[PDB]
Amino acid sequence: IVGGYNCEENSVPYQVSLNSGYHFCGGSLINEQWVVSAGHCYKSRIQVRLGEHNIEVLEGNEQFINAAKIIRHPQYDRKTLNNDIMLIKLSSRAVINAHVSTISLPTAPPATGTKCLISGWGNTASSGADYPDELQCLDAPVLSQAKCEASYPGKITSNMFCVGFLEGGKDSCQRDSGGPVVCNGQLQGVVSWGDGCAQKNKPGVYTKVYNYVKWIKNTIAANS
């Protein structure tokens, strides 16, 4: 996250990280045993970490849980990035407490201007590298379909939406992928892609979680 701030302790207790020897993506905890992430974060073996604040210093209440199932949406399109979503089933139930808990699925698709919270351990620099150990947060608004489409001509499917600032300076960035965009207690978005990070007229693009609510429910029901 570029232009964000250090999240308040315990303010984002649904944020998880995906690990394969190092932290490569984020995710959101939706159920004691299920995490939503991006399809492009797919790897064949993933350790989920929950309750992290500083990813370099174990503080007390973190849990590391191996992924038992890693289920990329079967129509994820490696070219257009449509259906960029993935479910992970944890091999053990997460402990739910002050530091770790679940986020609800959306009851409606995103609404323009809604004030949302984007979080992750992505790069804080729009040019070069400045990767933070402490979890970052960014307050950002849902952008109109018009603006999203004008930013990325021809590229914005019905399963994507844009959140952020056309002036630049504030955005998600590398290592935020798969992490949450939360608006009014609901997971609206999955961090997905952008033309760089925090550039003028190039807001971040996010997977539209509402469109996958039935796929998510059916997939969980089938693997329970």
Partner 1 sequence: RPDFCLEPPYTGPCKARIIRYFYNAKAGLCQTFVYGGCRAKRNNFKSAEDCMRTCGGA
Residue type, 96: I
- Using the contact rule CB under 8 A, the part of the chain among 7-15, 61-69, 156-164, 188-196 near partner 1 is 188-196
Distance CA 191, CA 180 (A): 6
Q: Phi-psi category of 60—alpha, beta or left, where left has phi over 0 and alpha has psi -120 to 50?
A: left
Using CB under 8 A, pick the residue from 56, 74, 79, 146 that binds partner 1: 79
| Distance in Å, CB of 78 to partner 1, minimum | 7
| Distance in Å, CB of 21 to partner 1, minimum | 9
CB-based contacts of 36, cutoff 8 Å, min separation 6 = 27, 28, 30, 85, 86, 87, 88, 178, 187, 190, 209, 216
For position 38 contacting partner 1 by CB under 8 A, the verdict is yes
- Using the contact rule CB under 8 A, the part of the chain among 27-35, 36-44, 133-141, 180-188 near partner 1 is 36-44
Q: Is 8 annotated as a binding residue?
A: no
Distance CA 37, CA 175 (A): 12
Nearer of residues 33 and 46 to partner 1, judged by Cβ: 46
Q: Is 62 annotated as a binding residue?
A: yes
Q: Could you say which residues in the range 111-170 bind partner 1, by CB under 8 A?
A: 122-123, 129, 131
Nearer of residues 82 and 145 to partner 1, judged by Cβ: 82
146-163: burial string, b at 16+ Cβ within 10 Å, e else: ebbeebbeeebbebbbbb
Nearer of residues 55 and 103 to partner 1, judged by Cβ: 55
Q: Is 52 annotated as a binding residue?
A: yes
* Residues noted as catalytic: 40, 84, 177
9-20: burial string, b at 16+ Cβ within 10 Å, e else: eeebbbbbbbbe
| Distance in Å, CB of 24 to partner 1, minimum | 5
- Using the contact rule CB under 8 A, the part of the chain among 4-12, 73-81, 90-98, 99-107 near partner 1 is 73-81
Nearer of residues 28 and 33 to partner 1, judged by Cβ: 28
Q: Is 136 exposed, middle or buried (0-12, 13-18, 19+ CB in 10 A)?
A: buried
Residue type, 115: K
For position 24 contacting partner 1 by CB under 8 A, the verdict is yes
Instruction: Give binding residues for Ca(2+) as ranges.
Output: 52, 54, 57, 62
Catalog residues that contact partner 1 under the rule CB under 8 A.
22-25, 38, 40-41, 78-79, 81, 122-123, 129, 131, 172-178, 191-197, 204
